[PDB]
Amino acid sequence: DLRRRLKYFFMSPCDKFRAKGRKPCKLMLQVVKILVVTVQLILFGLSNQLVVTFREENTIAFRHLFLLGYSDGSDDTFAAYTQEQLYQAIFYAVDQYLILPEISLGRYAYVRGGGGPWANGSALALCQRYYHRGHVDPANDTFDIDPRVVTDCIQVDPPDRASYKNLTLKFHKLINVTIHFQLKTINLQSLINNEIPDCYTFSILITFDNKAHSGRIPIRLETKTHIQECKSFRLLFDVVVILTCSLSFLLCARSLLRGFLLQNEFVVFMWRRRGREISLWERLEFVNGWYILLVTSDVLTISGTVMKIGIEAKNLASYDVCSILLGTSTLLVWVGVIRYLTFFHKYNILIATLRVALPSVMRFCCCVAVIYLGYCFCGWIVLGPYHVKFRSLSMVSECLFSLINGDDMFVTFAAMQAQQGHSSLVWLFSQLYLYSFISLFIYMVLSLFIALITGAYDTIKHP
Amino acid sequence: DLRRRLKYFFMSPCDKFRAKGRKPCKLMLQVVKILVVTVQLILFGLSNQLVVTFREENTIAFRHLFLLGYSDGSDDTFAAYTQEQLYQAIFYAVDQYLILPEISLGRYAYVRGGGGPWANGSALALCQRYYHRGHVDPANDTFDIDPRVVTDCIQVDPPDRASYKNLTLKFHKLINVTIHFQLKTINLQSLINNEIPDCYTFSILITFDNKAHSGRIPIRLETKTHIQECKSFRLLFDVVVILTCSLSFLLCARSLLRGFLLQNEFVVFMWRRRGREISLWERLEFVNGWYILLVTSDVLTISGTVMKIGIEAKNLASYDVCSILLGTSTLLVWVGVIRYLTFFHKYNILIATLRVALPSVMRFCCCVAVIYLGYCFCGWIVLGPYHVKFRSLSMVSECLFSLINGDDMFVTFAAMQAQQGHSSLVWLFSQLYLYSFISLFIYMVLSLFIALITGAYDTIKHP
Amino acid sequence: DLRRRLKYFFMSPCDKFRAKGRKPCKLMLQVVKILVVTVQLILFGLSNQLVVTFREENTIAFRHLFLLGYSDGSDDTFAAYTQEQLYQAIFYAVDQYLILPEISLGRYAYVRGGGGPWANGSALALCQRYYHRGHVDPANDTFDIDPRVVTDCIQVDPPDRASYKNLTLKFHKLINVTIHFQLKTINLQSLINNEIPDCYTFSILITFDNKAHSGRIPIRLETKTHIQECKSFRLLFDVVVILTCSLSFLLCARSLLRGFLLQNEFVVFMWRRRGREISLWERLEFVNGWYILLVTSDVLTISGTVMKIGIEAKNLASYDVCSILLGTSTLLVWVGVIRYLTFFHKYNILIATLRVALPSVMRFCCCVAVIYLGYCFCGWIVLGPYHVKFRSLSMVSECLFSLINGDDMFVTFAAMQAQQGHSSLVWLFSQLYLYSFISLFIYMVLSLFIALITGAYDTIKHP
Amino acid sequence: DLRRRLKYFFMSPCDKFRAKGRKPCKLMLQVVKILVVTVQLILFGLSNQLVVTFREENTIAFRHLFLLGYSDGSDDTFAAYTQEQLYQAIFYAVDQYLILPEISLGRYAYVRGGGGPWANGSALALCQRYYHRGHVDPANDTFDIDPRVVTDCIQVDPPDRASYKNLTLKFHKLINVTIHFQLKTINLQSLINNEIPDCYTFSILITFDNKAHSGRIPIRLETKTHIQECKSFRLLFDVVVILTCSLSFLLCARSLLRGFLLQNEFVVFMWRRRGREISLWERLEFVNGWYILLVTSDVLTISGTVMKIGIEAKNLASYDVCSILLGTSTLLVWVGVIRYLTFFHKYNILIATLRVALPSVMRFCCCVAVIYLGYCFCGWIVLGPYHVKFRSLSMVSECLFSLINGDDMFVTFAAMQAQQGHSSLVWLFSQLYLYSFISLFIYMVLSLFIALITGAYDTIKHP
Numbered sequence A, B, C, D: 001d002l003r004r005r006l007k008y009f010f011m012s013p014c015d016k017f018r019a020k021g022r023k024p025c026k027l028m029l030q031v032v033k034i035l036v037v038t039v040q041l042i043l044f045g046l047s048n049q050l051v052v053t054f055r056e057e058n059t060i061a062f063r064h065l066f067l068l069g070y071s072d073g074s075d076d077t078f079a080a081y082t083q084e085q086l087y088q089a090i091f092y093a094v095d096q097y098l099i100l101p102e103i104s105l106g107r108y109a110y111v112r113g114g115g116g117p118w119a120n121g122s123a124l125a126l127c128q129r130y131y132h133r134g135h136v137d138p139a140n141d142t143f144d145i146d147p148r149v150v151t152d153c154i155q156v157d158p159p160d161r162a163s164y165k166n167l168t169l170k171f172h173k174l175i176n177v178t179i180h181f182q183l184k185t186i187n188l189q190s191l192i193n194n195e196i197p198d199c200y201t202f203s204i205l206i207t208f209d210n211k212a213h214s215g216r217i218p219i220r221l222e223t224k225t226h227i228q229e230c231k232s233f234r235l236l237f238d239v240v241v242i243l244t245c246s247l248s249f250l251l252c253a254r255s256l257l258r259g260f261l262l263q264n265e266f267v268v269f270m271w272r273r274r275g276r277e278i279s280l281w282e283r284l285e286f287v288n289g290w291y292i293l294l295v296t297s298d299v300l301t302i303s304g305t306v307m308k309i310g311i312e313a314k315n316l317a318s319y320d321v322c323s324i325l326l327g328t329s330t331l332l333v334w335v336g337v338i339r340y341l342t343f344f345h346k347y348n349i350l351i352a353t354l355r356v357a358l359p360s361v362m363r364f365c366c367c368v369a370v371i372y373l374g375y376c377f378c379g380w381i382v383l384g385p386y387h388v389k390f391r392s393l394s395m396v397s398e399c400l401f402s403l404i405n406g407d408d409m410f411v412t413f414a415a416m417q418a419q420q421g422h423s424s425l426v427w428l429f430s431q432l433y434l435y436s437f438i439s440l441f442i443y444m445v446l447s448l449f450i451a452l453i454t455g456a457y458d459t460i461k462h463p
C-alpha cells in the first residue's frame, strides 16, 4: 500500500536516517547556506558603512562651507527671516564656491557644466522661482495671481586657476531660490585600503524654500552621490552564494513537489478505500511550511545578490532595494533555524507553545486594533494642533505604541502641561485621553496577552 | 404568548435573518457610518494641520522679527535682567515694526487702528502698567502702596509708504509692559492649492511681565488669528454625514424603545403568571448597551458636524470644541466595531474575558487610588520645593504614573542627586519615597492586575 | 463569661451598630480628619510654592546680575580656566554690586554690615583663602607646605546714593575666593495678594572654588533667605486640625487600651479553663494595626502642625522637617482608607490578596537583594571610572533599579559605546555585566514577583 | 558501612552541629570574608574616584587651554573645515603652551624632552604626516600615489622663565597633524588629605585627524597619566584580605577533596553490593557547587588584591584588570549569601523555583536568540545607512534589547520619521520591522518567560 510511503513522509530526519539510511543533504546544505548568506551580508554592510560615512562627512563639510552661520544641530531650525539675511545667505554660498580651492580641506574639483538643465554650460546655476503674477495686497484683500511658475536663472562660472551680486528677489511672489552645482572628489581611503577606484561626484542643492509664504524661509543643503571608478574574492563569494541558494531552491522545490504528489495519491485512496471526504486544511499537512520559507529566502538571496553584483561594479546604485532583499532573506534563514530545535522535545515544548497561542494572540490583536485606531484618530484630531507628537497619524501611532510599552510617557504629559494646549478644556481632555488609554492597554490588554500565552503553555504541558 | 417575542429579542443578528428573513439594515448602516465619519475626521484634520502650520510658522517669524536677540529653544528662559536690557528689547520691537515692510520676508500689512482699546486710532499701542502708589523702600521696610492699576499708553503710527523713544518706565512700581498691534497677511498656498480666500489677521501681543517683581522680567510673544475671506464637496459630504448619523439615530432609538416596551410587558407577565419579583438589574438586560453607544455617537457627530460647517465658512472658529466632539464620536464608532466581533465565539472569548475582569479591575483601582493619592500629596509637599517634576499636584501625578509604568525613572532619581534637595534629610526621604513607591506599585499592584485578568480568562475558558 | 465580650471585640463596625446600637464615632472622626489634614497640606503647599518661586526667581537674576558671561543651563559647567578669566569674573561681580540700584529690575537695598564675620562693618566681603606655605614646585617634586588656612579679606562699601581692584591672588596656593553680601527686597505680591508683610533678606555667596587644584575653578552663586515681616483663618484652621487629631488620638488610644486589657483577661481564662498555652503572636490579634497607624499619624500631624504655626508667624523656617511630618502623616491617613474597604467582601478579596502575598514578596526581596548588591559593587568598581551613571554607589543603585524597570537602558549602553571605556576589555565586561543583569532581573526575578502574587490570589479565591 | 558517612555528607550545617558537634568554621569564615572583601573594594573605589576626578578635571582644563574656541559638550563635533581654521587651531595650541605659566590656573611644569620619539630633546613636537606621493587630481581622475607615510616634525622649546609659525601643511596628501607634550603637576589634595606623594605627569596629544579625507578634520585632545611619588593600614588590610581568602580557599578545597573521595568510594560500593551502574551526573551530586564559587572567588580576590598592592605603591597602574578581578570576586561572594538562605524552607522555595525554571529559560533563550539575531542583521543592513542607532551590529543589539524592555522606543520611531530614510520604501520597511519586532518580543516572548517561571513556581508549591 502507501501507509509505508506516508510513514516515511511526516517522519523526523533522525528517523529518516535509519530507514534506507539516506544521507542528510538538505540539512547540511541549509547549515552551509546560513553561514554564507550571513557572511555575505556582513561583508555588504561593512563596505556600505564606509561609503555612508564618506558621503555623510562630506555633506557636513559642505554645510559648514556654504551655509552662512551654520552650526551643528540646527538643521531643522536653520532659516532666514529678513530680506537681508536671505541675500547674505545666498551670496555667501556663491562667494564660498568661487574660492573653494583655496579654503577647503578636501580636494574638490569643479564639474564644468554641472549646474543642471537650468545651466547654459555653467558649473553653478543660481535660480529663483516666482509666480507669473503675484499682485498680493493684504491692505484691501486683492489677489490678482497667475500660478504659472517662472524660473529666473543666473549662470556662474568658476575662476580659471560678478553678475550674481546683481540679483533682485521678487519677495512678494517668490517660491524658492535654489543653488545647484557639482563637486568631484576622490575617496583616498579606497586607494590605500582596498586599492579601489572611487571617484565621487556630489550634486549639491541648496534650497531657500518659501513655498509656505509664512515669513520664515528654511534653508537646507542636500547632496546626491554618483560613485564611478577613477581612471576578486567578493565577486567569487557572490557566485558561491548564488549557487548555494540555487541548489537549496531545487531540493526544497523537489521536496515540495513530492508532498503535492503524495497529497494527490491520498485524496483518492481515502475516497476509494473509505469514500471519505478530505477538507482543504486536511491537505495542508502535506505542505511543509519550513520549505516554503526556504525557497522564499532562496529567491530573495539570489535576487538580492544579483543586484549587489551590479552595485559592486558601479552599475546599479540601488542600495535600498538590495539591502532590503538581503536583510529580509537573512532574517528568514536565521528564523529557519527554529525548525532544527523542533526535533528536540524540550525545545519543541516552547516552540509549540507559541504556535498554539498564535491564533489567540492574532484574534486579540484584531479585537484591540479597533480600540487602538479609535484612540489614534481622537488624539490626532484633538491634540494635533497642540502636541508635537500628535502632528500626523503615523506619528500618533508611534506615540501611542510607545506609551503602552512604557516609553516616553512623562514628556507626553509634560508637553500638555507647558501651555495646556492654550485651553483648559483641551488640557482636561488630554488628561482623560492619556490616563484612560495607558490604564486600559497596560493593565487590561497587556495582562490578557500574558494570560493567552500562559494558557497555551498550560495545555502544551498538560495535554 | 410572548416567549416567541422575547426569543426574537436577545437573538444573534445571523439567527434573526433566518426567522422572518429581516434584511440587516442597522448593521449595514453602521458600517457605512463608520466609513463616513472616519473620512470626515481625516478631511477635517488634514485641513486643520495646514492652518496650524501657517499660524505657527508666522508666529516664529514674529519672534525673530520683534524679539531682540531671540533664538529658537529659548522661549521659557527669554527674559531681561537689567533696566537697559528692558529698554533695548522694547525699542527693538517698536523699531522693527516701523521698518517691517522693507525687512520682512512675508507680506504683512499694517492694520490701521489695530492697537486695541488702549489705541486712539493708532496701529500700535505701547502700554506700561504700574500701581498708583509704589513707595517701596526695603531700606527701612516701608510700603505705602495703592494697588490700583494705572495704565500709561503711547500711540505709535506706521510710516506712510519718535515719541516712544521718550519712554520712562516706573520700575519700582511696574507691573508689565505690553505691545499690541495687528498684521494682515494672505495665505498664498490657499489661492493656489484650493483657490480658497484666506486673509489672516494676526493680533501680536508682546508682554514684558513683572508681576512677580523678582528682578527677572520674562518676555513672551503671543498671536491670535482671525481668519476671514480675502475679497462644494466638503459641504455636501458634511450633509451626507449628518443624514447617515440621523438615520442611524432613529433606528437605534426605535430599537431602544422596543426594548423598553418589551421590558414593560415582561415585568407584569412574570408578576401575574408567577407573581415573581423583578429587580432593577433584571430589567437592564432589555437595554442594549451597544445601541446606547450608537445614539451617543450619533449626537456627537451631528452636533460636532454642525459646528464644523460654521468653521469651514469662517463664522465659528471654535476648533477645540468641534475637534473634541468629532474625535470622541469617532473613537466611539470604532469601539462599536467590537460588537460585531462578539458574534464569533473565538473572538467573544477575549471580549468576554475583559468584560468579566472589568469589575475586579475597577475595584482594585479604588483600593490603590487611595495609596496613590497619599503618595501624590506626600511628594508634592516634600519634593515640590526641590524637584522640577513635583511642582504642582497634576505634575506629581504625571510623574508618579510614568514611574509605575517604567518611564523617566533615572532622571527623577538624578534630579535629587544633583543638589540633594540641599539637605541630607530631604535626600534620604526621597530615597525611601521613590524606592518604596516604585517597588510597591510595580511588583505588587501591577502583578495583581495580571492575576485578575488571568483569573477572568480561566473562568471564561473553564465554566 | 467573656465570649460575649470577645464577640463584640473582633466584630465588624456594621455589626457593632446592631449590638447596643453604639454610634459610629471614630469612623466619622476619621473621615473628618482625612478631610482637614488633606486641606491643611494643600494650603501649606500652595503658599510654600509662592515662596519657593520668589526665592528661585531672585536667585536666577543674581546669577545674571553678578556672574560674568552667565547663561541659563550652564550651572554645573560654569568655570574659569585662566588667571585673567578669574580676575574678570571677580571684578565683574563687585563692579555690578556697586551699580546695582541703577541697573537692576528688582528693588534691592544694601544691607549695611552684611558681609558676615570677615566684614568689618562693610556690606561686601571679598575674601581669598590660601595655605600659609605653598612652595609647590613640580619641576623637581618639592612640596614645602603648611596646610594652615590664611584668610585674606577686603572690605567693600556701597556708594551713598577702589581698593578691590588692587587684588592679587596667590594662585599657586589658593583654595577659594568668596564674595559675601546681602540684599533686602520686599515681596510685592504679598502686599497685594494677601496683604502679608514679607521683607526678604538674601545672603549671596559667590564661590570661586579651587579646592581640587585641577586647573579648573568652578564658579557658583548660592543664596540663603531670611523672611521677616516688613514694618486669621490659617491659624484658626491649624488649631482645628490639632483638635481633630488630638481627639482621634485619645479615642484610638482608648480602643488600644481595651485590647490590651481584653488580651490580659484572655491569657489567664485559657490558662485556667484549659490551662492552654498562648504564644506572643496569638496575643497580637488583640492589636488593631489600623489603630497603630491612626495614632502614629495623629502624632505626626500635631507635631507637624505645631512647627507649621511657627513657620507661618516667621519664627521657625524649618520647612524640610515640617513638610516631611505633614507629608508622611497625610500619606498615612489616606492609606488608612483601605480599612474601610476591608468591610466589603469584594474589595477585601483584593486587599487580602496583597496581605497574604506580602510575606513571600518580602522574602524574595532579601533573596534578590544580595544578588542586586553584588552587581552594584561590581559596576561601581569597574564602570565608575568610565560611566557617568556609575560614579557613586547611590548613583549605581539608581541606574540599576531603573534598568530593571525598563528605563534609561539605551543611554547606559550608548555611554559605553562612545569611548568604550578606553579599553576593549572594559567594554566587553560592560556587555556581559549589563546583558546578564537586565536579562536575569527582568525575565526571572520580575516573573517570580508576578507568580507570587498570582499564587496568593489563587488561594484567596479558592480556600 | 558508609551510609553513616554519606549521611553526614549531604546534611544541613545545622544538623551537622548535632552530630559530633563540629564547630561551624567555614560558615563563620565566609561571613568574615564577605565583610573584608566588601570593605576592601569600597576603599579601593573611594580612592580610585579621587584619582579619576583629578585626571578628568585636568583634561577639561587642557581642552579649554589649548583648543581654540572650545566649549563644553562639543567634543564629538569639534572640527575644522577650512585651511585657515586648521592653521589657527594649530597655532593657538602652540601659542598657549608657550605662555602656559602666566595664564593657567593650575601649576604645570614643562617636562623637558617630553615631546616623544619625534622630539630631538624638545618639550613639544609638532608633527604633520602625509603620503610620499599624493598627486590627487579629481579633475581627470588621476591618482599617482605612494602610501608610504612621511612624518615631518618641528621642535618647539618652552621659554626659560618662532619656527612653528613657518608651518606649511600638505593638505592634498595630509593624514594628520599631532601635537605632543607633557605637563607635570602635583595633586595638592593628596599632600593635605592623606599626606600622600603624588606627582602626576600628563602626556597631552592633540590630533587634527584627516584620515578620512572628507573635508572635515575632527580635533580631539587626549591625556595619559603617569602617577609617581613627589620626592600603613591600607597595606595591612590588604594582607588581611589575602589571608582570609587563602584560609577560605584551603578549607573549601579540602571539602571538595572529601567529596571526590566519597564519590570514589561510592562508585564501587554500588558496583559491588548491587553491581549497579552510575552515570556522570549521578556523581555530580557529590560536587558542592557553592564551594566551586567560593574557591573561584578566593582566587579572584587574592589575584586581584596582589595587583592592587602594586597599584597602591605606584608600580602597576593596571586599574582595569584589578577592578574587574575585585569587582567580579565581590559579586560572587555576595551571590554566595544565597546558600545561607537555602537552609530555610520559606526562602528555599523561592531559590528552588528559580533553579528549576532556569533550564527552561535557558532553552527558550536559544530558541529566541536566532529570531533576535535575524532581526539584528536585517536592521543593520537596511537601517544602518539612515538610523543613528543602527550604525554597528553591537549598537543594533543594544537598540533592539532596549526596545523589547520598553525603552527608547519613540526616539527610534522619530528618527525614521525625520527624513524617512530618504525613501518611502525604506520608511515603510522600518514600520513593519519595528512594529513586528516589538509586538512579537513583548507580547509573546516576554509573556512566555512569565509562564515558565509561574510553571516552575506551581511545581515547587505543589509537588
Ligand SMILES: CCCCCCCC(=O)OC[C@H](COP(=O)(O)O[C@@H]1[C@H](O)[C@H](OP(=O)(O)O)[C@@H](O)[C@H](OP(=O)(O)O)[C@H]1O)OC(=O)CCCCCCC
Residues within 6 Å of the ligand: A008, A016, A022, A023, A024, A025, A026, A027, A247, A250, A251, A254, A255, A258, A288
Ligand atoms: C532540474 C531539477 C532536478 C532536481 C533533481 C534533484 C534530485 C536529488 O538530487 O535529490 C536527492 C538528493 C537530495 O537529498 P535530500 O533533499 O537531503 O533528501 C531528500 C529528503 O529527505 C526528502 O524528505 P524531506 O526534505 O524531509 O521532505 C525525501 O523525501 C527525499 O526522497 P527519498 O526519501 O525517497 O530519498 C530525499 O531524497 O540529492 C542530493 O543529495 C544533492 C545532489 C545535488 C542535487 C542537484 C542536482 C542538479
Ligand SMILES: CCCCCCCC(=O)OC[C@H](COP(=O)(O)O[C@@H]1[C@H](O)[C@H](OP(=O)(O)O)[C@@H](O)[C@H](OP(=O)(O)O)[C@H]1O)OC(=O)CCCCCCC
Residues within 6 Å of the ligand: B008, B016, B022, B023, B024, B025, B026, B027, B247, B250, B251, B254, B255, B258, B288
Ligand atoms: C419618526 C420615527 C420613525 C421611525 C420609523 C422606523 C421604522 C423602520 O424603518 O424600521 C424598520 C427597518 C429597520 O431595520 P433594522 O433596524 O435593521 O431591523 C430591526 C432590528 O432587527 C431590530 O432588532 P435589534 O436592532 O437587533 O435590537 C428588530 O427588533 C426590528 O423589528 P422586527 O424584528 O419586528 O422587524 C427590526 O426591524 O427600516 C429600515 O430598514 C430603514 C428604513 C429607513 C428608516 C427611516 C425612515 C424615516
Ligand SMILES: CCCCCCCC(=O)OC[C@H](COP(=O)(O)O[C@@H]1[C@H](O)[C@H](OP(=O)(O)O)[C@@H](O)[C@H](OP(=O)(O)O)[C@H]1O)OC(=O)CCCCCCC
Residues within 6 Å of the ligand: C008, C016, C022, C023, C024, C025, C026, C027, C247, C250, C251, C254, C255, C258, C288
Ligand atoms: C483622658 C482620656 C479620656 C478618654 C475618654 C474617652 C471615652 C469615650 O468617649 O469613648 C466613648 C465614645 C467613643 O466612640 P467610638 O470610639 O466610636 O466607639 C468605641 C468603639 O466602637 C470601640 O471599638 P473599636 O474602636 O472598633 O476597637 C468599642 O469597643 C468602644 O467601647 P464599647 O463597645 O463598650 O462601647 C466604643 O465606645 O466617645 C465618643 O463618642 C466621643 C466623645 C468625645 C471623647 C473625648 C472626651 C474627652
Ligand SMILES: CCCCCCCC(=O)OC[C@H](COP(=O)(O)O[C@@H]1[C@H](O)[C@H](OP(=O)(O)O)[C@@H](O)[C@H](OP(=O)(O)O)[C@H]1O)OC(=O)CCCCCCC
Residues within 6 Å of the ligand: D008, D016, D022, D023, D024, D025, D026, D027, D247, D250, D251, D254, D255, D258, D288
Ligand atoms: C595544606 C592543607 C592543610 C589543610 C588542613 C585543613 C584541615 C582542617 O583544619 O579542617 C578542619 C576544620 C575545618 O572546619 P570546617 O570546614 O568548618 O568543617 C568541615 C565541614 O563541616 C565539612 O563539611 P562541608 O564543608 O559542609 O562540605 C566536613 O565534612 C569536615 O569534616 P568532618 O565532618 O569529618 O569534621 C569538617 O571538618 O579546621 C578549622 O576549623 C580551621 C583551622 C584552620 C585550617 C587551616 C590550617 C592550615
Ligand code: NA
Residues within 6 Å of the ligand: A405, A406, A407, A408, B405, B406, B407, B408, C405, C406, C407, C408, D405, D406, D407, D408
Ligand atoms: Na520604559
